[PDB]
């Protein structure tokens, strides 16, 4: 059965900084396999630590690099002889942030739309709701003001990031936070 995978304090990590990835399940897995899909694929075998009905494993990144950025998935290890692994956890993107110029972010029951703008020719824009592990992405279009943009329809605290095609897990500096109330 599918374990849970989270990032502490969060998944948007500055260069050379720290993040802890936690795998956990109520199924008592002896081991966990933390897979990374990115510019440098890898699998990390983690000891399943057992306490009061839960099996947990931490993978600490002590210094964030491009090699460690990617989409992570956690699997619980079931058996060794009839080799079996569980269903993967929900995917978690661990991104390097703060690499480029910060974009600008502009704003009961009404449709709110948030816009990501910069003069830099970012290929993708990323919207982040603080505290929420998953981010929304949208391509950038050019405007007659010499500024690239992306509008995110919401239908919390928000931050905006830009990235390039050849490095999808290397984002810009976060925009100033925009509180939506």
């Amino acid at each position, epitope marked *: 059965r599918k374990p849970s995978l989270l*990032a*502490h*304090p*969060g*998944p*948007l*990590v*500055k260069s050379e*900084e*720290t*993040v802890i990835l936690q795998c956990w399940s109520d199924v008592m897995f002896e081991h966990f396999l933390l897979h990374r899909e990115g510019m440098f694929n890898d699998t990390l075998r983690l000891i399943g630590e057992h306490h009061d009905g839960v099996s947990k494993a931490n993978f600490s990144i002590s210094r964030m690099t491009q090699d460690l950025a990617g989409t992570y998935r956690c699997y619980g290890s079931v058996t060794h002889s009839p080799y079996q692994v569980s269903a993967p956890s929900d995917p978690l993107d661990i991104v390097i*942030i*703060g690499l480029y110029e*910060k974009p600008s972010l502009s704003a009961a029951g009404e449709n709110v739309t948030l816009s990501c703008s910069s003069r830099s020719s970012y290929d993708m824009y990323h919207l*982040s709701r*603080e*505290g929420e592990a998953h981010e929304r992405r949208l391509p950038a279009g050019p405007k007659v003001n010499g500024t690239f943009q992306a509008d995110f329809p919401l239908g919390g*605290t928000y*931050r905006c990031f830009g990235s390039f095609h050849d490095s999808p897990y290397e984002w810009s*500096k*976060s925009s*100033d*936070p925009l*509180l939506v109330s």
Partner: nanobody
Amino acid sequence: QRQLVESGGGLVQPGGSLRLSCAASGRSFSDYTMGWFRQAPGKEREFVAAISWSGGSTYADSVKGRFIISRDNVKNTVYLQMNSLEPEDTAVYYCAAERTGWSSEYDYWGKGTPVTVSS
């Protein structure tokens, strides 16, 4: 999310010491990296020290060995113990917070506390 309030600033003689405090009144305090910055007359605002969500400290080389940063996650407070103060340390001292894991910036700032090392 945050509102930071500094205190403890004042007049001090060279070689003296001073302890600054910063009260933070927001949710998830223990998860923020807290920093101290300073702006001397005619200079740009500069980093002095930071204390990570994990408790790890970082210092500007100009302050290394003389200042100590600490945090209290029960009281939601940050401290800057400033020892062996020289007139070069005269500046407005600011407390700042970074939502590590969600932002690359110190988005939250206090209004400052003035520190003057006379003569």
